Design a protein around this ligand. Structure first.
Ligand SMILES: Nc1nc2c(c(=O)[nH]1)N[C@H]1C(S)=C(S)[C@@H](COP(=O)(O)OP(=O)(O)OC[C@H]3O[C@@H](n4cnc5c(=O)[nH]c(N)nc54)[C@H](O)[C@@H]3O)O[C@H]1N2
Ligand SMILES: Nc1nc2c(c(=O)[nH]1)N[C@H]1C(S)=C(S)[C@@H](COP(=O)(O)OP(=O)(O)OC[C@H]3O[C@@H](n4cnc5c(=O)[nH]c(N)nc54)[C@H](O)[C@@H]3O)O[C@H]1N2
Ligand code: SF4
Ligand code: SF4
Ligand code: SF4
Ligand code: SF4
Ligand code: SF4
Ligand code: SF4
Ligand code: SF4
Ligand code: SF4
Ligand code: FCO
Ligand SMILES: [Fe+3]
Ligand SMILES: [Mo+6]
Ligand code: NI
Lengths: 136, 249, 714, 532, 170
């Protein structure tokens, strides 16, 4: 029940952990300048409940065996990550995290989707423009 | 009157003079061998108060390092702030701040004292203790373990140094994520994980399901390990139910 | 858990609502088996009734009478006693110092019912002694009723709404069934389901233009050229029932010599539509056995509105589709009681039952039956020219009753200036609207769901709505307020319920004599003219069976040359603005602005429809805030970029309060009917650099608007 | 169905007052009475029917029925059921008749409803501000659903405290001895004003709610259903499992939720394990003012082995997180259960020797008798519920009257003394340690088995119920109404010491200055649980 | 062998009654008040688009908590199990899943008293797969065929033109 650390190689940018945080230690903001999603963790808010490791799809956030957490300045509490947003292929509005889409494509290839990555244009399309596709 | 405000009247943290703030390092090396600490409990739960009082208990001691709890702010060299600053508690905390002799050391204790914790955006709190007074050392936790309290006081007194630092964005953000336990199909793994989480726990359930997963490599052999090693009736019931979920699939 | 059968208070489709009520609260709205709807309702009928619960989503519902002591003072709550003694002393003082005509009194058209309109015009013409009564049929189908009275004789819808289901062709001209009267759109759907071809003449690609064998995308304001072209195709290809044009009508040679100069090739550019599809449309409408014309606000709301109605009705005479079932001219009405307000006499030139005031015989009959010597005879001043008469110094007081002229009138700056010099504005409303805030005296009124009366559908069909719940603020119905006001200064005027008023109406009208409460009852549909209280007369489905109800008994042909709209597209105003409705919300958004299910779909500031190419090149994205500038104001709405609107014009929505398009609309009134030109004015759309500052300018102005109305009413 | 007889008695005493009545569960009942006839009904059910005023609170139902709702929860203890008295206060003129002139236990609930909702109980003598701070602007009523955003913070009007303290028995010559809010060994903010003449206390007033975060509003705006279990744990560190079980059982009673068999009585095991932790802390503090300190550090030692089973049954210290709405999060295993059994026994070994201190009886006979006497006449009026009311003579216990987490399968014993001194309340807590250790001895050896979690259910909107737990300081009554599948419409919690606080004036009267911190700590206050 | 609701685009008049019917038949229940079918418009066609209830479900494959399962021939999503990972809105080839949460009950959008300084504003809307408000927990909102309701779907019943009809295979 120590400090929550995040593995940035396995975080897909799905505000699952952010939505389950009771104290809003985990925050995400969408930065249109940079086309990046700013994932942030603050240790000054964390109540060490452990919901973040409970709800993580890819088990990136874990609570370690680390209890010596005192700092001199408040900015050392922060763990930060930035993930490139995926632009749509019909419009060009940013609609999802590119790493999340790639992880979804990898998930679909495993259980048997022989031609999953040849359908990448369907995955990188916004759900509004995907609904207009089946209208025609 | 006691604290500075904006044009709207909202309180702001106090700003010490730099003549007053210039000798903080000399004060720290002066009180390195003997620290007089006054607990200033604000709007917080006893957790962040009893554990601070447990820093002089039989399990963890503070007088061996020189820390002695004082009954008055006038005796204090370190002002330990505990809870989120309630509107009724801002004025007594400020009074305890000005009552102490300058210069001072302020240590924020706990999530509720660092930033407000779970009550950070709420009408009756002002947030953390840094929203009313300057803070030198931040100690997180809800509640902080006595080892963390000793580490925080030792790092404040210079006996230890800071361990954790900030982590910024980098190259590891854009490296792709990998499928975990990518041997069997994801549906069953998810179903047996949910089945173990219903019967054992978040923690116990991931543990039992992962044991079962390593034992899906040899059905009979590790079915046998799960059955014999533990000899726990409960763990055995968890494994039998997980096995029926996977089998029926 | 009893069910109360009511009539939907929004549009003239006249659907029946089974309001399920438990305790004294409404739990749901159910589709009733009425004549028009037959168990199908739109979203406004299903989830548009919860405005009576004072939800305060947009505006607070009225509770108490409030008197403003001095303009610049505030609305301070007052008892009904002096609210009404003030509204009698001030009115009597004005009619003494200035004139009976210095007063002006509107009639409502939404939830008050027919009997309230009758007692309001009775109050005005008897106690006041004026013909200064005008509902908002003035800004509606006023050109339509004037042109039909001058041309065919009867100014109402000549056929039933249910009669469109069995026509052989439906000719929609400047009408949007799918967004104005959705059940009428469903009737057009089944008409296409019965084999009828549909011809839609609309610059946009509306949902009714989708179910169409062919669609005409014409230039804005060029209806007369197209109508003359297709009439010329009908005449020259000799395609008409001359039997009909020889026996029943009169004036064919003038039409022939005035239309022959309008061939399709000359208008192939003023109407922007090619000649081949014009010939196809004229041939298809001519060869249809029984075909109907449905027209809306793309016809009347112009400078050339009356002439366009004359052209359409004359062309109906050419095709011979006038007087037989599943045919005829069908001007689809607007509000749920605008046809009712027209019948009841809430117009400045007629008495109840479509009897005009120029005849001294009607002016003797109604003076004998009411009680003064003779009612005033002068045709009176109209609500559209009310700022013109107020600023010039001709009208002094305005009894606004159940309308919102500070939101739903052209040149809102002129309306505000008129209300400032008008020394008294009495607003009798059920909500704290924009006009209700700028009112010197305001009287709360009983809503639609809490009183009794008679509604009239688009196809002149009477219907009954019953009381569901009691009012919770001891506030009385509108006819009670009118009767008490008339009692405190004039005539002894007292009524017990609406049945007595309806009986008095049948006494004063030979055309509503067969429409009694028990014949209509719960699920009845009685289309005037009905003459016998016997079960003999169930109503009259179609008009003009044997006589056209003309002084000659013969229809008249008329059309004129096309002239351009007054405002021109200039260097800094290259964009045509057309103010057009949408489904989901109703006019002025007082009711439907307080419904949670309806306000959860579209709130503010609304969508101004932009053609894709027009925005691609002017720099405007699919949901961007856009500064729309005109000669009289600048406002903000979003943009809905799609290729459904035609290029060169924007189609925009007046129900929104922040970014209302009535500031942009220059009022140029018609030549004789005096209707504002909403469907054509010149604007310029321009993008905004910082969208976040404009988005914040949406929110704070939306909250500062609600701050005023929640300060004055509460 | 429980509660039919009381409803019949109310109907025969008042013929046409009960406008509506419904059953939440079998033992839970609510009645809607007339507004102008409210004080007679609650006084009748209190005095004549032997009911205890558990909690009373307001509600904001102006978009549900157009009226405010003030509830009056009464516990029938003469079988035993819950009766809630509901009234419909008018919207634009919020005024309802007060109960405090008739029932003295209605003195702070009717002061809280003046501040949170702005409703005005006419005839209330104590009109002072209770929960809101002194710098709070007047008409901002926080718990009104349209008064303000939860995130809005008004400017403080004053920096100095403007609270008025009454002196019932003193005069303008008496001095005052503060004992808060910043006092050592208090460890938690709360002000006290000892109007003293010498070392004797003539009168005692106090100012509280310095730790008023405002979590009642935050539980219905930013926070869901499973996340309020974290809010209940972070109220105070020692009642954490008491608040969580009280909140969880309020939401599982609001729906059906047939919880699994062992998931009930494991909560009963952990509820008693927590009162090992809290009573042995108070007994350590009982020796730190009686005198001996080598009786405190040693109670700290037996508290540590109570913390050792709390380390193994959960793995946490103080605030935990082991209950969800359907059931318990983390689940106990076999050796943990065999082990906790004799560490329960060796504590009964250690506890017996350490309790040989009062057998010693020197400062435990002169400092702890005749000091802080709580009149059972007064305790009946103000409806105290903790070891206060059990020492005074009333056998008030939730686990015997209303078994909530399967306490009927556990050996229940209620201990009530006759004296009303500090030493009498220690004897309540001493016998409760052995009683809780008997349940740990008999709970973990006969678990019924089965599943642990029931999830996937859908929250029916506008369903409410009462949840209750037996905290170490009394009962905490949690009333929660479901709003939708995600959020709560309203959650109300009353602490164990919330009922206990208004009788501290009658304890500190007639005593000394020196033993006044002992009198306050004799009932073991949890300021953070009552300040909310 | 799947049950789904399809829309006839030739019969749809774009009245948004189906959107208000689906939004209100769930708001009276406990579920989300966002409509599960959205009227899509282009030049020649107009029809609401909703969940196809596929025989093999890409949404159910990528679900980390098994919140999406097939029962009664319909692909049904449990809104009490979704952890807002937003992976179902990517794997859905028809865009049938959007993400919204519950507002605080009986509280208006702007409840800022003029007695205090205003609260910080909400972040700007970009996409339902990216947006996060601290007080709102977004949940995968999908057509559940109104299985809780006893008289079938409310979109089929309250359609004025009878465009929507339930396609049902055993
Ligand atoms: N730009 C532009 N402007 C237009 C139009 C357009 O197309 N474009 N359309 C025009 C047309 S065709 C029309 S008909 C008008 C309609 O516009 P209005 O004449 O403003 O009619 P409503 O919008 O219904 O105004 C209804 C008012 O009456 C009140 N009311 C509703 N029910 C009752 C009731 O039972 N009793 C009382 N006492 N009051 C009640 C409502 O609260 C509200 O204040 O708008 C015209 N304005
Ligand atoms: N939802 C809803 N329904 C309403 C109302 C409401 O406020 N809300 N109001 C009611 C009222 S008050 C009324 S009067 C009726 C009127 O209802 P409609 O008659 O349908 O009126 P509009 O939708 O304004 O105009 C219909 C069409 O006129 C077209 N048009 C614009 N300019 C021209 C032109 O130069 N030539 C031609 N041929 N067409 C043109 C527009 O493109 C639009 O497609 O609706 C009623 N129904
Ligand atoms: S839940 Fe896991 S994958 Fe998702 S944002 Fe949090 S850490 Fe990253
Ligand atoms: S441990 Fe709890 S409070 Fe801390 S980041 Fe994770 S979810 Fe948030
Ligand atoms: S940090 Fe945690 S334990 Fe300490 S006062 Fe805040 S909420 Fe309570
Ligand atoms: S067409 Fe008119 S009356 Fe019928 S449901 Fe729609 S709004 Fe109501
Ligand atoms: S309710 Fe019916 S007509 Fe309206 S948009 Fe939906 S399917 Fe089309
Ligand atoms: S959500 Fe999409 S993928 Fe899943 S069943 Fe529905 S249509 Fe198919
Ligand atoms: S949003 Fe919910 S249903 Fe969709 S993938 Fe994530 S957890 Fe599963
Ligand atoms: S079937 Fe039910 S859930 Fe799906 S769109 Fe229709 S009403 Fe909504
Ligand atoms: N015990 C305890 Fe905490 C308090 N007061 C609770 O409930
Ligand atoms: Fe796109
Ligand atoms: Mo109209
Ligand atoms: Ni407590």
């Amino acid at each position: 029940r120590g400090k929550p650390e995040q593995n940035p190689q396995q975080c897909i940018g799905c505000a699952a952990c952010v939505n389950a945080c009771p104290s809003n230690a985990l925050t995400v903001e969408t930065d249109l300048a940079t086309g990046e999603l700013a994932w942030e963790f603050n240790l000054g808010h964390c109540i060490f409940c452990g919901r973040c490791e409970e709800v993580c799809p890819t088990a990136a956030i874990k609570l370690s065996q680390e209890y010596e957490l005192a700092v001199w300045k408040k900015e050392d509490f922060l763990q930060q990550s930035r993930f490139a947003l995926c632009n749509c292929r019909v419009c060009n509005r940013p609609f999802a995290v590119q790493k999340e889409i790639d992880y979804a494509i990898a998930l679909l290839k495993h259980n048997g989707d022989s031609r999953a990555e040849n359908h990448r244009e369907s995955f990188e399309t916004c759900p509004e423009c995907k609904r207009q596709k089946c209208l025609v | 009157l006691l604290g500075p405000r904006d044009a709207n009247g909202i309180p702001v943290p106090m700003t010490v003079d730099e003549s007053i703030a210039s000798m903080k390092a000399s004060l720290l090396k002066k009180i390195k061998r003997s620290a007089y600490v006054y607990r200033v409990d604000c709007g917080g739960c006893n957790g962040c108060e009893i554990e601070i009082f447990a820093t002089l208990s039989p399990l963890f001691d503070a007088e061996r390092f020189g820390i002695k709890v004082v009954p008055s702010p006038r005796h204090a060299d370190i002002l330990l702030f505990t809870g989120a600053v309630t509107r009724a508690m801002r004025s007594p905390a400020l009074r305890a701040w000005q009552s102490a002799p300058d210069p001072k050391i302020c240590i924020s204790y706990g999530a509720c004292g660092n930033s407000g914790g779970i009550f950070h955006d709420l009408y009756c709190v002002w947030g953390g203790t840094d929203k009313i007074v300057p803070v030198d050392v931040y100690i997180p936790g809800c509640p902080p373990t006595p080892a963390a309290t000793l580490y925080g006081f030792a790092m404040a007194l210079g006996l230890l140094e800071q361990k954790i630092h900030a982590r910024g964005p980098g190259e590891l953000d854009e490296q792709p994520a990998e499928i975990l336990h990518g041997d069997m199909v994801q549906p069953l793994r998810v179903k047996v994980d949910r089945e173990a989480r219903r019967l054992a726990g978040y923690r116990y359930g991931r543990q039992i399901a992962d044991d079962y997963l390593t034992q899906l490599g040899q059905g009979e052999e590790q079915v046998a390990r799960w059955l014999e090693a533990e000899n726990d009736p409960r763990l055995n019931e968890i494994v039998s139910h997980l096995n029926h979920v996977v089998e029926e699939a | 858990m009893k069910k109360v059968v009511t009539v939907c208070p929004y549009c003239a489709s006249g659907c029946k609502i089974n309001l399920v009520v438990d305790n004294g609260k409404i739990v749901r709205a159910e589709a009733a088996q009425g004549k028009t709807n037959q168990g199908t309702l739109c979203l406004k009928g299903y989830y548009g009734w919860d405005f009576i619960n004072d939800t305060q989503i947009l505006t607070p519902r009225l509770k108490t009478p409030m008197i403003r002591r001095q303009r610049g003072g505030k609305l301070e709550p007052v008892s009904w006693d002096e609210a009404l003694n003030y509204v009698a002393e001030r009115l009597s003082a004005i009619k003494e110092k200035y004139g009976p005509d210095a007063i002006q009194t509107t009639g409502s058209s939404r939830g008050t019912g027919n009997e309230t309109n009758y007692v309001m015009q009775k109050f005005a013409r008897a106690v006041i002694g004026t013909n200064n009564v005008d509902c908002c049929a003035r800004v509606x189908h006023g050109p339509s009723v004037a042109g039909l009275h001058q041309s065919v004789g009867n100014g109402a819808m000549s056929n039933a709404i249910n009669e469109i289901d069995n026509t052989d062709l439906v000719f929609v001209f400047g009408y949007n069934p799918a967004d104005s009267h959705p059940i009428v759109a469903n009737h057009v759907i089944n008409a296409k389901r019965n084999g009828a071809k549909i011809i839609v003449c609309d610059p946009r690609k509306i949902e009714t233009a989708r179910i169409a064998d062919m669609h005409i995308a014409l230039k804005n304001g060029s209806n007369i050229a197209l109508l003359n072209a297709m009439g010329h195709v009908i005449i020259e290809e000799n395609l008409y029932d001359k039997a009909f044009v020889a026996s029943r009508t009169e004036g064919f040679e003038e039409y022939r010599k005035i239309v022959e100069g309008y061939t399709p090739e000359s208008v192939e550019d003023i109407t922007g539509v090619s000649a081949s599809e014009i010939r196809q449309a004229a041939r298809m409408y001519a060869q249809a056995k029984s075909a109907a014309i449905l027209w809306g606000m793309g016809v009347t709301q112009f400078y050339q509105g009356v002439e366009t109605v004359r052209s359409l009705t004359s062309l109906a005479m050419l095709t011979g589709n006038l007087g037989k079932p599943h045919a005829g001219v069908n001007p689809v009405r607007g509000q749920n009681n605008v046809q009712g307000a027209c019948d009841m006499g809430a117009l400045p030139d007629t008495y109840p039952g479509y009897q005009y005031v120029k005849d001294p015989a009607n002016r003797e009959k109604f003076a004998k039956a009411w009680g003064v010597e003779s009612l005033p005879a002068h045709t009176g001043y109209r609500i559209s020219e009310l700022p013109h008469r107020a600023a010039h110094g001709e009208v002094r007081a305005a009894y606004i009753m159940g309308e919102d002229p500070l939101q739903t009138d052209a040149e809102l700056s002129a309306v505000r200036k008129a209300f400032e010099d008008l020394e008294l504005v009495i607003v009798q409303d059920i909500f704290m609207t924009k006009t209700a805030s700028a009112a010197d005296v305001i009287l709360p009124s009983t809503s639609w769901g809490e009183h009794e009366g008679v509604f009239t559908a688009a196809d002149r069909g009477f219907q009954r709505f019953f009381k569901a719940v009691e009012p919770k603020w001891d506030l009385k119905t509108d006819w009670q307020i009118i009767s008490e006001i008339a009692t405190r200064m004039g005539y002894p005027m007292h009524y017990n319920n609406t049945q007595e008023i309806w009986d008095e109406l049948r006494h004063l009208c030979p055309d509503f004599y067969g429409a009694t409460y028990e014949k209509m009852g719960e699920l009845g549909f009685i289309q005037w003219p009905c003459r016998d209280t016997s079960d003999a007369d169930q109503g009259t489905s179609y008009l003009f069976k044997e006589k056209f109800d003309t002084p000659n008994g013969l229809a008249q042909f008329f059309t004129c040359d096309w002239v351009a709209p007054i405002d021109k597209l200039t260097d800094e105003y290259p964009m045509v603005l057309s103010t057009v409705r949408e489904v989901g919300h109703y006019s002025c958004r007082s009711m439907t602005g307080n419904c949670a299910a309806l306000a959860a779909l579209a709130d503010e500031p609304g969508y101004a429809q932009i053609n894709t190419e027009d925005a691609k090149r002017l720099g405007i994205e699919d949901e961007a805030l856009v500064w729309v500038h005109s000669r009289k104001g600048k406002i903000i709405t979003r943009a809905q970029v799609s290729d459904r609107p035609n290029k060169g014009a924007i189609y925009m929505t007046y129900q929104w309060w922040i970014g209302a398009c009535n500031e942009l609309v220059t009022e140029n009134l018609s030549p004789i009917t005096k209707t504002p030109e909403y469907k054509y004015c010149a604007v310029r759309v321009e993008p905004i650099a910082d969208q976040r500052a404009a988005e914040q300018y949406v929110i704070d102005e939306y909250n500062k608007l609600k701050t005023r109305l929640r300060e004055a009413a509460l | 169905k429980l509660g039919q007889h009381y409803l019949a008695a109310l109907n025969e005493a008042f013929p046409g007052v009960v406008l509506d009545h419904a059953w939440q569960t079998k033992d839970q009942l609510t009645v809607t009475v007339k507004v102008n006839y409210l004080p007679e009904v609650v006084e009748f059910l209190y005095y004549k029917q032997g009911g205890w005023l558990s909690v009373l609170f307001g509600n904001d139902e102006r978009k549900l029925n157009g009226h405010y709702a003030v509830y009056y929860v009464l516990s029938m203890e003469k079988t035993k059921c819950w009766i809630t008295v509901r009234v419909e206060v008018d919207a634009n003129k919020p005024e309802y008749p007060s109960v405090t002139p008739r029932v003295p236990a209605a003195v702070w609930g009717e002061r809280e409803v003046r501040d949170m909702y702005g409703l005005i109980p006419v005839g209330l003598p104590d009109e002072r501000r209770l929960v809101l701070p002194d710098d709070w602007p007047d008409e901002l009523y926080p718990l009104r659903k349209d008064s303000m955003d939860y995130r809005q913070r008004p400017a403080p009007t004053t920096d100095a405290e403007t609270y008025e303290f009454i002196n019932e028995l003193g005069d303008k010559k008496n001095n005052v001895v503060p004992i808060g809010p910043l006092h050592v060994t208090s460890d938690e903010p709360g002000h006290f004003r000892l109007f003293v003449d010498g070392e004797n206390i003539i009168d005692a007033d106090y100012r509280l709610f310095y730790v008023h975060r405002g979590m009642e509003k935050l539980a219905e705006t930013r926070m869901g259903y499973n996340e309020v279990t974290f809010l209940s744990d972070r109220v105070c560190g020692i009642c954490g499992f008491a608040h969580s079980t009280a909140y969880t059982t309020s939401v599982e009673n609001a729906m059906g939720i047939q919880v699994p068999e062992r998931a009930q009585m494991i909560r009963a095991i952990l509820l008693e394990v927590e009162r090992l932790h809290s009573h042995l802390l108070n007994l350590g503090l009982a020796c730190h003012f009686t005198g001996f300190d080598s009786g405190f550090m040693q109670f700290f030692r037996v508290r540590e082995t109570s913390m050792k089973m709390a380390e193994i049954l959960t793995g946490a210290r103080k605030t935990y997180g082991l209950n969800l709405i359907g059931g318990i999060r983390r689940d106990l295993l076999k050796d943990d259960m065999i082990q906790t059994r004799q560490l329960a026994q060796q504590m009964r070994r250690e506890v017996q020797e350490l309790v040989d201190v009062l057998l010693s009886t020197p400062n435990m006979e002169q400092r702890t008798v005749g000091i802080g006497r709580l009149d059972p006449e007064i305790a009946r009026d103000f409806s105290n519920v903790g070891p206060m009311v059990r020492a005074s003579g009333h056998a008030r216990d939730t686990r015997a009257d209303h078994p909530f987490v399967g306490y009927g399968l556990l050996p229940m014993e209620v201990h009530s003394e006759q004296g009303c001194d500090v030493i009498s309340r220690l004897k309540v807590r001493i016998n409760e340690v052995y009683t809780a250790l008997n349940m740990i001895d008999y709970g973990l050896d006969n678990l019924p088995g089965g599943p642990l979690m029931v999830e996937g259910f859908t929250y029916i909107p506008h369903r409410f119920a009462l949840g209750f737990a037996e905290a170490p300081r009394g009962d905490d009554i949690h009333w929660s109404m479901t709003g939708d599948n995600q959020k709560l419409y309203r959650w109300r919690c009353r602490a164990a010491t919330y009922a206990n606080w208004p009788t501290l004036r009658y304890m500190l009267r007639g005593n000394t200055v020196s033993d006044a911190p002992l009198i306050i700590g004799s009932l073991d206050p949890c300021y953070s649980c009552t300040d909310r | 062998m799947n049950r789904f609701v399809i829309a006839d685009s030739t019969l749809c008049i774009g009245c948004h009654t189906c959107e208000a019917a689906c939004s209100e038949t769930h708001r009276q229940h406990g579920l989300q008040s966002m409509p599960r079918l959205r009227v899509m418009l282009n030049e020649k066609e107009s029809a609401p688009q909703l969940c196809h209830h596929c025989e093999d479900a890409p949404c159910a494959v990528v679900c980390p908590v098994n919140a999406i399962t097939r029962v009664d021939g319909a692909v049904q999503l449990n809104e009490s199990l979704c952890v807002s990972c937003k992976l179902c809105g990517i794997a859905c080839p028809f865009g049938a899943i959007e993400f919204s949460g519950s507002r605080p009950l009986d509280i208006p959008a702007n409840a800022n008293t003029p007695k205090a300084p205003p609260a910080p504003p909400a972040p700007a809307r970009v996409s339902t797969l990216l947006d996060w408000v601290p007080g709102i927990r977004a949940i995968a909102v999908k057509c559940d065929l109104c299985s809780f309701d006893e008289q079938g779907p409310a979109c089929v019943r309250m359609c004025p033109t009878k465009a929507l009809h339930l396609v049902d295979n055993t």
